[PDB]
DNA sequence: CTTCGTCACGGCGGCGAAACAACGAGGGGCTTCCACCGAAACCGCGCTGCGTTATAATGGGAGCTGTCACGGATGCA
DNA sequence: TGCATCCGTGAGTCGAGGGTAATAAACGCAGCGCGGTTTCGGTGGAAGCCCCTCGTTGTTTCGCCGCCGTGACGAAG
């Protein structure tokens, strides 16, 4: 069967990377059918690269503070946790940052080799002081979804190591809400409103296109049970 | 069209306090039941039994 | 299922017939009738100003 | 109260009376006046065709001729299509 | 409207009528469930109007 | 590869048809009755009103009467 | 003066919602105004009778289709 009334899609910007997407008119109840799935996908289907582990000179058990820099260790930890990076290899990549002298150490001071790119150099990190001299080492990779911090089993081998979570999916948050567009004249049609909001490394719309790709692939994996099955279709464009 | 932003009145016997009546902007609803926003019922003191 | 259907308890009227003595509308769902606005509604009605 | 004004009739009665002017005036004015007193609408007395001879200086048979001249050309649906909604 | 409303409409022990007491004349006390109802009159099935 | 056939392109022009103005025979304007409306009339009679009834007959049937409280207006002592 | 004692009030915004009874009557007369009825009537709707409004020709002229030739892109060997 055909949808019998072609729905549309409109992307509306709110910021450089945050945008809403209005779809209308979906068939009755179809807002939920795809919205929750789609938000789950966006949260758990778009590849990206994020920090995985850390180790810095000076600290072996002092998981509170380290000299040179003034703030605590958790502050620097959470600063680096929200770091946008892109990697082109599934091996573990390493980056260093080493700033001598007091000042404000930022994410522009990190020296990422080619194959690992940073999209927020101007993100402050540390209030280095007292002629502080540091050496922070970041174990980074790429994946998808949210991977919590995997602790170091080889505690002795990497004993100054620090396991950390990873927001591999480049989107930060997406929400969806349904509506009652032309329920009376056109039999309970509904309009979905999506709101997607993503890192600066990528856009809001592109990860959406990739989510559409992944999900249409995932459902082709199922439609290949009866290739000529009469479902529903859309029509022209 | 004609119901485009045309306020109407909702009353319930008894009306005791001033807010026993309320003006609402109405929207067309399929069916024969008036759908009351679930917040004003306190003032209306109206339950759906 | 109880015998209190919303198919039975709706009455609408823009303008129907009118009372004999007064020109006022009549009461009832059977006759096109008309809705009653009481004094106790007039109270809140002024309290709104 | 049996004497209640439906108040759709009244507005529609004004609309009847106004479509009447709009249709009569689009017709000739001699004929419009002829009927206004023949049926005596604007007055209380519909008239016979020999009263019209004084007011319009013509033989009553000529108003017999004009009555059909009114009606038949009216009987062209153009006048009828806009007036048949009035019933 | 149901076999019950057919039956339980009978076996009804009314208080009003000729020789009965009108509602406004029917004061608070008479409405009470007298101890002398045990087994005689249903102490629970009464109109809630 | 060569050479012939066709099909518009554009005009030419001479026919040709439709608009516009000198006006005269179907309508407009005459009598000439009487089946008729319509009048005017000539009525009778259902329909309302109104009168009378001649032994004595000589005091209502009925109604079921109560709340709850409260101020106050009203017959006593 | 008290002082009891009746008593005149109100006591929910509101939806479900048409109706139940009785006694002695006759005759007769008058007005009566509604409805059978009984006149001609001229004004009604035909029937027959005369002056003025509407159709023939006499061009005019853009228009247009046949014609006339041109040229090329085509048409066939």
From Swiss-Prot, chain A:
GO MF assignments: DNA binding; DNA-directed RNA polymerase activity; protein dimerization activity
Region (Alpha N-terminal domain (alpha-NTD)) residue spans: 1-226
Keywords noted in UniProt: DNA-directed RNA polymerase, Nucleotidyltransferase, Transcription, Transferase
EC code: 2.7.7.6
Keyword presence, Transcription: yes
Coiled-coil intervals: none
Superkingdom: Bacteria
Secretion signal, residue range per the UniProt entry: none
GO annotation (BP), single: DNA-templated transcription
Keyword GTP-binding: no
Family statement drawn from the similarity comment of this UniProt entry: Belongs to the RNA polymerase alpha chain family.
Complexes and interactors: Homodimer. The RNAP catalytic core consists of 2 alpha, 1 beta, 1 beta' and 1 omega subunit. When a sigma factor is associated with the core the holoenzyme is formed, which can initiate transcription.
Function statement: DNA-dependent RNA polymerase catalyzes the transcription of DNA into RNA using the four ribonucleoside triphosphates as substrates.
Protein name as annotated: DNA-directed RNA polymerase subunit alpha
Organism: Mycobacterium tuberculosis (strain ATCC 25618 / H37Rv)
Lineage: Bacteria, Bacillati, Actinomycetota, Actinomycetes, Mycobacteriales
Gene transcribed to yield this protein: rpoA
Curated annotation (Swiss-Prot), chain B:
Top-level taxonomic group: Bacteria
Inducing factors: 6-fold repressed by starvation.
Residues given in the record as Mg(2+) binding sites: 47, 49
Assembly description: The RNAP catalytic core consists of 2 alpha, 1 beta, 1 beta' and 1 omega subunit. When a sigma factor is associated with the core the holoenzyme is formed, which can initiate transcription.
Family of this protein: Belongs to the RNA polymerase beta' chain family.
Functional summary from the UniProt entry: DNA-dependent RNA polymerase catalyzes the transcription of DNA into RNA using the four ribonucleoside triphosphates as substrates.
Protein name from the UniProt record: DNA-directed RNA polymerase subunit beta'
Organism: Mycobacterium tuberculosis (strain ATCC 25618 / H37Rv)
Gene this protein is translated from: rpoC
Residue span relative to the full protein: 489 to 537 of 1316
From Swiss-Prot, chain C:
Gene: rpoB
Quaternary context: The RNAP catalytic core consists of 2 alpha, 1 beta, 1 beta' and 1 omega subunit. When a sigma factor is associated with the core the holoenzyme is formed, which can initiate transcription. Interacts with CarD, TRCF (Mfd) and RbpA.
Similarity-based family: Belongs to the RNA polymerase beta chain family.
Organism: Mycobacterium tuberculosis (strain ATCC 25618 / H37Rv)
Source organism superkingdom: Bacteria
Functional note: DNA-dependent RNA polymerase catalyzes the transcription of DNA into RNA using the four ribonucleoside triphosphates as substrates.
Entry protein name: DNA-directed RNA polymerase subunit beta
Part of the whole protein covered: 1032 to 1080 of 1178
Curated annotation (Swiss-Prot), chain D:
Residues of the full protein shown: 441 to 527 of 528
Induction: Constitutively expressed under all conditions tested except for 3-fold reduction in stationary phase, standing culture and upon growth in H(2)O. 2-fold induced by starvation. Half-life of over 40 minutes.
Domain of life: Bacteria
Comment field (misc): Was identified as a high-confidence drug target.
DNA-binding residues (ranges): 49-68
Function in brief: Sigma factors are initiation factors that promote the attachment of RNA polymerase to specific initiation sites and are then released. This sigma factor is the primary sigma factor during exponential growth.
Species the sequence originates in: Mycobacterium tuberculosis (strain ATCC 25618 / H37Rv)
Family, per entry: Belongs to the sigma-70 factor family. RpoD/SigA subfamily.
Annotated region described as Sigma-70 factor domain-4, given as residue ranges: 23-76
Compartment(s): Cytoplasm
Free-text comment about domains: The sigma-70 factor domain-2 mediates sequence-specific interaction with the -10 element in promoter DNA, and plays an important role in melting the double-stranded DNA and the formation of the transcription bubble. The sigma-70 factor domain-2 mediates interaction with the RNA polymerase subunits RpoB and RpoC.
Self-association state and partner proteins as the record states: Interacts transiently with the RNA polymerase catalytic core formed by RpoA, RpoB, RpoC and RpoZ (2 alpha, 1 beta, 1 beta' and 1 omega subunit) to form the RNA polymerase holoenzyme that can initiate transcription. Interacts with WhiB3 and probably with RbpA probably via its sigma-2 region.
Name of the encoding gene: sigA
Transmembrane annotation, as ranges: none
